Symmetry: C6
Subunit: 304 residues, 6 copies
């Protein structure tokens, strides 16, 4: 909805956003939203995501698709009215994204999803990319394991010519929706094929906000390697504007840079990661700050 501010309430908002990343207990936001979702009336639509055509499918708190749901209006705090209607498996009225309020007045945050090796990581969408030899797939799985911590991470597989990989975009959004409804740490192996259908465009523009609202993190690999400035520029835009965090390889094999947006209007942070391979390509991230817009575009230059 829309929110109104004066100097006092605005400074309070920035303090709360700053805290959502810097001082809240890691993963606390996810626990909170899990609670909100479980308290939802059974059968109530909670999430809508776009399919290939641009239409939207809808899920309930248990990640089950809602094929029929009669028009139901709810008036928001600001006066706006939300209408949700599902017919023949598709959204007749409503919008893409969360259909129930998980945030309230606390918007514009990058809720801390986990802490690892002395660094806080943000929920939302993390794009792992870059040119060079450092492998992306091995890195997204290591990050998944590390941010997972005590919890297992969920893996969504899409669009790679390997066994058992789904390549149908509509099955893909279903897997993603289920993952975000049920897990805090999610890995997507290959955003490459979404990079375009209406649904694919909606996905790139919606996923970061969906994840950040839930307090979960979606870690996705994206190979820039493609000298087609129509696509390479989309890679740079996806990484620049649709990602909450960016993990990009460097000049040194095994080394990566993490650039994190800490919240609305706040500074991006940066830190370096050292990694090494064990058996069967299992990668390990070794354990034992603020950057400006200029530095950011310098990094984006890497993908050309």
């Amino acid at each position: 909805m829309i929110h109104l501010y004066d100097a006092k309430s605005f400074a309070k908002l920035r303090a709360a956003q700053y805290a959502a990343f810097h001082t809240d207990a890691p993963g606390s936001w996810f626990d909170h939203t899990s609670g909100v979702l479980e308290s939802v009336e059974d059968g109530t639509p909670v999430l809508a995501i776009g399919v290939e055509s641009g239409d939207a499918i809808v899920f309930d708190k248990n990640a089950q698709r809602i094929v029929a749901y009669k028009e139901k209006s709810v008036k928001a705090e600001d006066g706006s009215v939300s209408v949700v209607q599902v017919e023949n498996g598709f959204m007749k009225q409503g919008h893409r994204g969360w259909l129930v309020d998980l945030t309230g007045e606390l918007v514009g945050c990058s809720p801390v999803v986990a802490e690892f090796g002395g660094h806080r990581y943000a929920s939302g969408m993390v794009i792992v990319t870059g040119k060079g030899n450092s492998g992306k797939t091995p890195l997204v799985h290591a990050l998944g394991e590390a941010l997972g911590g005590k919890d297992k991470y969920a893996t969504v597989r899409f669009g790679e010519p390997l066994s058992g990989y789904n390549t149908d975009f509509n099955v893909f959004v279903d897997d993603i929706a289920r993952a975000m409804l049920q897990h805090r740490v999610i890995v997507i192996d290959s955003l490459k094929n979404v990079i375009i259908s209406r649904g694919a465009f909606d996905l790139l523009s919606d996923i970061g906000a969906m994840a950040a609202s839930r307090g979960c993190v979606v870690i996705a690999s994206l190979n820039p390697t493609s000298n087609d400035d129509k696509i390479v520029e989309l890679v740079k835009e996806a990484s620049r504007s649709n990602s909450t965090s960016l993990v990009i390889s460097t000049d040194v094999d095994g080394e990566w840079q993490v650039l994190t947006r800490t919240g609305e209007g706040l500074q991006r942070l940066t830190h370096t990661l050292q990694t090494s391979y064990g058996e069967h390509s299992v990668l390990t991230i070794h354990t034992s700050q603020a950057s400006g817009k200029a530095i950011q575009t310098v990094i984006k230059n890497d993908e050309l």
Copy 2:
């Protein structure tokens, strides 16, 4: 509608437009239009805005959507007839923009919306952009608070991968419409995703006139950073032609230049802003003239 002029009535018009910016009390046009809107019969359509598909949704004076409205024709002073009809939630007959006359013969103005730090600011649309390190988001919120003055400003959030952010264009135009119907100072955090669907194109072409007619100001951030001349040129076109005022960053961090169109056929004004950060990135605009077309393009060059 159309208007007829001879030398005398044209000179009176330019004098009135000059005064709407330079001498009228700041914010007075907004108070004036609020009264016009409140005198509208209950249930009467007053504003129509384009949704993604190019269709339009319609609202009444209280910012409630009209789903059904039987054909009604009104003849204007110039002889033009306006027919409005709403069916199944969408405008069947009518046009985008204000459906009731808010201006009469007083057209082509940039009604002063507020005065801050010794400078007058125009209503209409203000695009905050430029390249460099100066952050745009902190600046749009500082301007919102500053021009808000004694009133709170409204914040419309769209298309950022952060918590609670709507990413659905149709929810976005609903928020924008309600905001212009009810508030004098509005901030849009991220015009980046509109920059294209029929709806998005309609929005860039319509918003400035809609706001200037209401006497409200809409402050939107737009990042030029994207070396794709297809998009970078659309940013410059939006900044050059669809904006009532332009706020652009300079070579000096923290410093900004404000270029203001004062009215139809009138000269653009320019002044500079110095700013600084407090805690949690809250920016403050420090407190304690005419330019030509050449200078303007010089400034536009900056976004390349």
Copy 3:
């Protein structure tokens, strides 16, 4: 319709076209067509103009839309048949342009619309453009007033982020149709937003001929400034091929060049205008010749 000629009838035709511009009384053609229009039976469709979709709306002699009109055929002198039919507010049968013959055998003329400062000006469409510091909006209004003479000029406002400006293309063509049905001098402030929908394309290709047939002049501003050779070339093409006359700014501020197509197969003329500003940006054109295609292309080069 089609016309047949031999050497004798062709020479008489060129003499008549030459006279329509060089010696007829200024504005006499407009008075003649006004008589033709008023002698039309009531309810008879006289003008059709394309809306955004490419469909067309129809007006009677009093500039009122015709929503229903049963099929009616008329045979012309050349044997062609014109069938007009309007259903549900849109043309079902007919063509864009004048639905009643305003010209007969006298076609291919640029009927003199007015005389000012010792120069004859042609009716039809006049595009005011150019790069540089010289302001286009103040010039179109000064030309409107000057060619208006004893008559007031009509102003059609479209697509500028200023108060009361319509930004809906369909309201725009309704405004234009009414202006041409009722006034000899018309100003359009901003052809910029038409420069593309089917309707916008129809408008650029139809307006000059509609106005020249009527004997009225449409003075429209168009800013070339936009380094996108897709658009900048559309500005050059419209100025080259869709304009009866072109008014373009020069190297010297305040100075403009007027290039006039005097008639079918006849030579283009050229003259210069000096101007200055008074209070509130009111511009005054100071008072007290054949060119070749080469010269024309040189002038067009200016818009790059």
Copy 4:
């Protein structure tokens, strides 16, 4: 239809084609086809031409549109079957072009349409173009008069911002169809606006063959001036491949080059024209050979 040949019948065909241009009496082919058309059963569809949408309208021998005509099959010599059906004003079954056989076994000809100043001119389509100062409109009218000889020439006017010019493509094909059904020499003032809708594409690809089959000549002006290689290349292709003859200006003002295709597989001929202006821009062509493909492209280079 398809035709079968052995060496003997092929040499006979080339002899007959060669004769159709070089030795037949000028204009004899047109007289012959006029006879064939007048002998046609009344109400029988004889010509179909594409409108803007790509649909086709149909005319009878008297240039009157056929709105309804029930399915009717005719078996051709080669075994192919022609079906013609018109419903609600449009062609339901059939093809664009002549719906009755005007040629027989004599195909691939450029029937001599007239002789003037010691030169034979071909029927079909003549495109008058080129860069430089020599005016095209004055030249197409002089050629029209000269090839007309004892007969008047017909003028189709389309897409110029001058009085009485039709700008509706569907009215334009009707005028063209009527002209070809009833006159031997036709002038089209401005192919510029057709240069794209389905109908416009059909027109460029159909007109030359339609005219050559009828034995009439269609003289059309086409200004290349437009530095948009998307359009300029279409001008060159239209002139190279859709024209039976080409008349292009040269380095010397008033001088033109005529390149004529004399028939299927035959050599293109070339000759020069000297011209001068009299009063009111009436141009006169003064009165008192084989070229290779290379020379042809040299000339095409001129339009860049």
Copy 5:
């Protein structure tokens, strides 16, 4: 259908393909397929070809169009089922190409169509092209007569601005289909206009295989002359990949090079032709080897 091979059956296949070009009697495959076609039940669909829209028209063995044919399924040797159904003149079920099997296990051949001047020529499609002065039209007709030998050749005419030329694509594919059903040597005068609608794209991709399967040869001229890399590259792609053989002009007027694909996986052959003109442009090919991929691209370079 699909075919299964081991080393032995594959070696037999290559031996049979080698013989279909090098040792079978010239024209024998065409005689063979004529018998297969004549053994087809009356009224049975045997060939389907795409019309402009992408739909397909269907013919029986006597080259008569089938307007209605009830669903009929046939199971092939490999297990694939072919279902054919024609409704209202268009294929409702089926595929483009031959609807009856003309080849069995003998696939991937370039069946020798004729022998002339000591050289064997392949059936399938032959593109005659190149830059320079050597005329293509005279050459396609000389090859037609020469390969025709004791039989007349069929000429399909399309898209030239000359008398009696069809310019309607749908009439064109009807002529082509009837020609391949009834004649061994076919000349197409002007593939220039197909070079794009779904139908045109289907034609370039289908014609070569259709002809090579029938054992007939289709000789088509294609002018590369058009400096529009969009089109010039399509010409080279057509010459490189959609042609069974290529006949291209050289630096020496009258001289041509013939590049022949002899079969699936086999080497391309090359030989040279000397030619001369007699009366009325009738060309005669004078009478009295392997190349690599490199040489081939060298030749393709010529068309730029």
Copy 6:
């Protein structure tokens, strides 16, 4: 479906993927999936593949199309539900790819398809390409025979101007579906014509995964030669991202490099092949390793 992992389960997974390529018996996965497929209830849909329009056709375990199948839902281990429904020959509900689970928890593998000349080859899709003189068609057939071993390989022929080649995309995907349902080694001679319809796009993105899931190998030729960076880049992208393995010609005639993706997150391998021709162009691959991303891009450079 989606899968959950912790450090322990992830390491077990990588060990299993590593083994599926490096140590499992060659061709064992194909035998396993053949068993899964044969144990499927009769009439059950097992594979869906997209046709030209983007719609999909469905096959049962015996490679016979299913034209009608009433809605039927199945719940997977992860909670996702698969609903399959076929109506009028097309999939009404379901997804492209395998409709029955052939993999379970073992996904992301490149199951070894065969061993030849001391090298293991992966199932999935293999693209044979490169510029130069080395022939692709003779190589795909030699690879087919060699990987076939004791089994015959299946050949799918598409889009070449040779006898018996199908050129209809819908017959093509039917051929491919049947080949993968019944054979371990499949050759596709000419992916060139798919390189675009929705179906063609679906095919490039689906085939590798379909084949790898089955344990069969699809060996497809693709000629890069075409200087149209729109297409040449599509060849590089397909070879880079849609291929399980790549076989590319080198500087030395007869020599090829094989780059193999061994599994999800695992290293690519590389080895060289020497070849020679026997009679009738039958090629023989002579008998008697990890690379980095840099090396891969270097090889891709070759196709420019």
